[PDB]
Symmetry: C5
Subunit: 209 residues, 5 copies
C-alpha cells in the first residue's frame, strides 16, 4: 500500500502479514457473506493493484467465484479502454496484469494522482457484489415467516436477504414499512397490527416472543 | 481512530486490521453476551464515526439486531437535532453518513473539541444494551439450580443472567442476598442454610463441591 | 498501560485483549493463566485491568468471587491508609479517573495503583485456580489403566495449583509419586532403585 | 528480513496456513507475500517450522540441492583476491544459507550493487513448491467431469482449482475454458448450457444450472 | 528481549503453538525463532506459561538443573549456573552480563540448555523407532513417507543415519506393490520420482 512518510511524501509499504492473514481467514470462514465486502475495503486502504492481486491470489477454494471475479475485471478493463484510449495506463495496467509495481507507484503518487488502486478496487467490489448475490442461500421471492418460526429468526433472514440482494435504500425502506409485517405468520401478523403504526422493530420483536 | 503516538501526540490512523479481526471474531463467537459491550468500548478507543461504521458494517449475521441498532441510532440522532438545531454537526454528521472524515477529525480535534466519536459511541452502546437485554431474556427469577446441576454451573448461569439484564449494583446485591440461596436445589439449599448469613460466594462454593 | 518511549500512556492494545480473552476461555483457570495474566498486564492502569476482567466471557461464578476478593482487599487497604490519596476503590479503578490513575502512577514518589490492583487480582486468581482444582495431592493416584505420563501430568498440575514451593514439590516427588502409582508401575519403579530421575521413571513405565 | 528478525505474527500465520491448506496452489503467493525481503536464514526458519508434510519438505530440500549445484556450475568462484568494502562471492550453499552467516547474507543483500541471495533462494523454493503443488493435485484437467448429481458450482470449483494446480498459461486456461468446461458437464447441465449459445459468461452459465 | 519486555504477540503465538503441537519436532525451531534476543527472564516467562504437559516441564527443569551444575563445575560479578537459568539473578544483572563487553550471553546459554531439554522430550513423546515404520498394505505411499520422515526428525538422527535410512529402509519397508515399483526405478531415484511412481 501507499502511505505518506513523516516528511509528507507518498511512499510504499509492502502488504503486511497481519493484513494478509486476517483477509485470508475472513474469506475462508465467511465464504461470500455480504460483510466480506466492507471487510475487503477496510483491509485494502491505499492498496496498489499489486497488493490487490496478492489479496485475490491468496484466497483458497472458491475458484468458481474467483474465476467470475476475473471475468468482471476483464469486462471493466475493456470498458475503461473504450472510454480512455510517464505513459497512460490501459485497462490491464489498472488490473495490474501488464504493469509493474514501479509504474503503479508512479501513477498513485503523481500530483495530481491517478489512483489506479481505487479504480481497480471498484472493479473488484463490483465483482464481489455479483458473487455475494449469487451465493446467498436466500432470495427475494421467498421471504415469509414459517408457521412455527420464531419472529427473530424470520427477521434475520429478511434482513440478510435484503443485504445480499443489494436492495436500494428506497427498496429496503419499502420492505421494512410493508413486508416485514405483511409476510409474518398469522399469529405474529395479528399481534403486529395491534401495535398500530410507528412500532419499532424492538417493540415488534418483544410483542412476538 | 485518533490515538496518541509514543511521543504523546494525537494522530489519525485508519482502523487497524488487528482491531477489525478481533472485533469480527468476538461478535461472531459471543453473539450478544454482555461482555461484548466492554469489548466494543476497548476496541473503539478514539474511533471516528467512520471507524465506528466500519465496525458495524463488518458484523456478519445478526441482521435483526443490526437493524434494531440502526433504529436506535436513528432515534438518538433525531433527539440530538431537537436539542441542538467550522459548521455545527447535525445528527447524521455524528452517525457519519453526511460528513467527511476530514470534518469528523476537525470536530474531534478542535479546541474545545466536539467529540462526535464519543457521542456516536454512546448511541451505539445504548443500542447494544437493548440487544443484550433481548437476546438473554430469561428472568433472574427463573434461574434455579437443576436437581443434578453442580453448584458452580448454576452460579455461573445466575451471574451471567444478572449481567445480561444490566442489573444496578443494588439489584445485584439484593438478588445475591435473596435469590441465590433461595433458588438452589434442596440438597445445596440445606447445606447453605447451615452456613448461615454473611457467607461469601467462596465459602458457599466450597461447601457445595 | 504506561510504557517508556519517558513514560507514556497507550490504551490497551487489541492484540493483548484478544490473546487474553482467548487464553482465559480455552484454559479455564488452569494454573498457567496466572503468569500469563502477569505478562499480559505489564504497566497496566486500573482501567486496563478492569477491561481485562470485564471482557472475560463465562466463568461468572469465578469473576464474582474475584470481585469479592477485590472488595476485601480494598477495605483492608482503607484500614491501613485512611493530588489526593487513593482509597481502596480508587485502586480498583471504580471511583477514579484514567487521569488520576496516571497521576498517581507517575507521581514522584509513585503510588503504583496498577501494581497494587494487580496483586489483589492475583490473589483472587490464586483462590479460583485452587477451587477449580480442588483435589489434594494426597488423593492423586494412578488409575489402573492410566498411562504413567498422564498420571504424572495430573500429579504436577495439582502441585502447581496448590502453588507448592520447590522444596514441597521435591518432597512430594520423592515421597508421594512412586507411592501412588498403580501396582504394575509401582513395582517397576521400586526395581529402579533410589536416585532415579523423572525421565528414567517415565521411560521405565511407558 | 531487510534488518528485523522474522516477526511472530508472520511465523504464526505462515505455520497456520501451511497446516490448514496443505499444498493447495494459493500457498505459493502466500509464501511470497509472507517472505518480502527475507534473508536465507528467515527462509530456513519458515521451512523448518512446517510440521507434517515431511515427504514434501524432503522433496523441497532435493530441489534446493539441484538448484544450488546448478548455480555453482554457472558461477564458480572468480579467482583472485577480494578488495576492501567488497566481500566474497556467494556459492550455491551460501544462497541456501547453509554455509553462510547472517552477517554475510546481509552484506550481500545490502551491498551496492546488491547480490540478492534472499530473492535467489526464494526462486528455488518457489520452484520446489510448484512441483509439490502439482504432485498433491495430480488429476488432469481432462479427467475433471461433472458428477451426475454434482452441483454445477462444485464442479466448476474443481475444474479451476485443477487448472491452477498445473500452472496453466493464460492461453491454455482460455483454451480449456472455451473447449473443456461445457464439454465435461453432466448431460442435464450440458444441455442447458448449449441452449445458452456462444458468448455466455461463466456467471450466466452458473445461473442457468443452479 | 534485547530492552523490550516480551511482547504479547510473541507470548500468545508461543502458547498457542505448544498447546496444539504438543512436542512435535517443529516446536524447537519455533521456540528458537520466538526467543531471539531473549533474557533468562523472558525465557522463564515462556516456560511458565505453557499449560499442561507438566511431566515434560518437570523433566525440562531437571535438565536445566543438570546443566547449571555442570556450568558451575567448569566456571567456579560472574554468573553461577542458577544466575543463567534466571532463578538467582535480577533482570538488571542479566542485562549487565548480556551487554557487557565482551558479553556473557546468558540468554543464549540458558537457550541451549532449554533446547537440550526440549530435544529429550521430543524424543520421548515420539518413541516409535524408524525400524517399526512400515507402509501399511493399503496406505498411500505419501502418508507412509510422511510418517517415515516425521519419525526420523523426532529421533534427531545424524545426517549419516538419515542417509542410511533413506537408502535402506525407505524402499525396504514399503508394502510389496510399492516396493516392487520402486525396485524397477533403479538407483539414483529422487524422492519426487519415487512418489510419482507410487501414486
Amino acid at each position: 500500500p501507499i502511505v505518506q512518510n513523516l516528511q509528507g511524501q507518498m511512499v510504499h509499504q509492502a502488504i503486511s502479514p497481519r493484513t494478509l492473514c486476517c483477509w485470508v481467514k475472513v474469506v475462508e470462514e465467511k465464504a461470500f457473506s455480504p460483510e466480506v465486502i466492507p471487510m475487503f475495503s477496510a483491509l485494502s486502504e491505499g492498496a496498489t493493484p499489486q497488493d490487490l492481486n496478492t489479496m485475490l491470489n491468496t484466497v483458497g477454494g472458491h475458484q468458481a467465484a474467483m474465476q467470475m471475479l476475473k471475468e468482471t475485471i476483464n469486462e471493466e478493463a475493456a470498458e475503461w479502454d473504450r472510454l480512455h484510449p510517464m505513459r497512460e495506463p490501459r485497462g490491464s495496467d489498472i488490473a495490474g496484469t501488464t504493469s509493474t509495481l514501479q509504474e503503479q507507484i508512479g501513477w498513485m503518487t503523481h500530483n495530481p494522482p491517478i489512483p489506479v488502486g481505487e479504480i481497480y478496487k471498484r472493479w473488484i467490489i463490483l465483482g464481489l457484489n455479483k458473487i455475494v448475490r449469487m451465493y446467498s442461500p436466500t432470495s427475494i421471492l421467498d421471504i415469509r415467516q414459517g408457521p412455527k418460526e420464531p419472529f427473530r429468526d424470520y427477521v434475520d433472514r429478511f434482513y440478510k436477504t435484503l443485504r445480499a440482494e443489494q436492495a436500494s435504500q428506497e427498496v429496503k425502506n419499502a420492505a421494512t414499512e410493508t413486508l416485514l409485517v405483511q409476510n409474518a405468520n398469522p399469529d405474529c401478523k395479528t399481534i403486529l397490527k395491534a401495535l398500530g403504526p410507528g412500532a419499532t422493530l424492538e417493540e415488534m420483536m418483544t410483542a412476538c416472543q
